[PDB]
Amino acid sequence: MNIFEMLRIDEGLRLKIYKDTEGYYTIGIGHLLTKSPSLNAAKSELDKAIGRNTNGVITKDEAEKLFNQDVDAAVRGILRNAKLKPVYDSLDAVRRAALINMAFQMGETGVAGFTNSLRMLQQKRWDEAAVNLAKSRWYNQTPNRAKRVITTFRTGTWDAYK
């Protein structure tokens, strides 16, 4: 298991534009296109991302290319963020993947708002962090996914994904 396989499990793979859990236009492996309620706007963002007139459908390779780019940006956002970097540096390899997962889903800004959980993770207070992470809209809205990430932080193992 690795970050790529982990997120591919959490986000799935779709080759046509679809609406995410928040009702936003997305494609591929959780690649958000826009928060605009306009499909045309989504098709436009899509074509610009791919570099061709897609008509709202991409290929597998195309989805994977967006995904590599998105994973890279996620990590880079963490490393550039003053509140996130130190947490990330303190964690082991499995738990780093859980932090990337959250950043991919909610953006660096969203993640940095879990101040209190972040501090517990940095202190390596696993059970406490898990409890704090669960008191969030994130957990209430996408409970199965949040449970999987939380267990990852708690245990430092890939068991939730096995």
CB-based contact 46:36 (threshold 8 Å): no
Active-site hit among 5, 10, 11, 22: 11
What is the closest distance, in whole angstroms, from the C-beta atom of residue 90 to Cl ion in the complex?
27
Residue 125 or 161 having the CB closest to Cl ion: 161
Shortest distance, CB of residue 142 to Cl ion, whole angstroms? 4
62 is catalytic: no
- Single out the catalytic residue among 20, 47, 64, 128: 20
The length of the chain, given as a count of residues: 162
Q: Using DSSP, how many helices (H) and how many strands (E) does the chain show? A: 9, 3
Catalytic status, residue 11:
yes
Q: Which amino acid is at 157?
A: T
- Please give the helix or strand (H or E) that residue 33 lies within, else none: strand 31-34
Check: CB of residue 102 under 8 Å from CB of residue 153.
Answer: no
Q: Which residues bind Cl ion (CB under 5 A)?
A: 49, 142, 144-145
Residues serving a catalytic function are 11, 20
Q: Residues annotated as binding site for substrate?
A: 32, 104, 117, 132
